[PDB]
């Protein structure tokens with residue numbers, strides 16, 4: 001169930017109601033442990049819930065954790081490193097894909113370190129429409145606070161040395 005280094009995997013995101021949200025066709029595995037999966041992708045096909053497709057324009061390093069309710073996408077744009085963080089179930093991985101539930105809230109981090117919590121409106125609507133249990137609401141709000149602290153502390157994928165190591169490792173394997 002732990003992906004191997006050099007493996008190309010699919011990533012499948014779902015909503016709480018079981019519907020597919022988004023699928024990324026190809027991510028190369030850089031690190032696979034029981035707790036952490038790091039991958040890189042570049043010009044991967046992306047499929048939306050209506051089947052519509054688009055191809056990513058730039059490389060990304062992706063960070064998944066088995067014990068935290070978020071995952072982190074690290075983007076290399078012309079004026080520096082952008083992060084897009086999903087609030088989410090932790091991941092599971094099987095032969096089909098690395099899989100998680102998308103829980104609406106998102107955090108964007110700019111090259112200057114500024115972060116913004118996005119999609120409180122999306123979250124409120126979906127939590128009512130799909131009847132998220134109280135304990136999911138508590139865990140997600142706890143994990144928003146944990147993720148803001150990781151960003152402020154430059155912990156995990158927010159460490160500049162993390163970016164140096166994995167961006168170079170992906171450039172070599174690709």
Ligand SMILES: Nc1ncnc2c1ncn2[C@@H]1O[C@H](COP(=O)(O)OP(=O)(O)OP(O)(O)=S)[C@@H](O)[C@H]1O
Nearest residue numbers: 011022024041056060062073084086102104106119
């Ligand atoms: N797994 C991924 N691999 C590569 N790029 C990704 C990945 N996930 C997100 N991105 C990039 O991160 C940015 C935001 O991701 P989106 O696909 O917009 O996700 P999202 O923010 O969860 O959207 P909503 O709120 O569900 S419509 C875009 O630049 C994406 O290309």
Ligand SMILES: [Ca+2]
Nearest residue numbers: 086102104106
């Ligand atoms: Ca999201």
Ligand SMILES: [Ca+2]
Nearest residue numbers: 104105106119
């Ligand atoms: Ca969202």
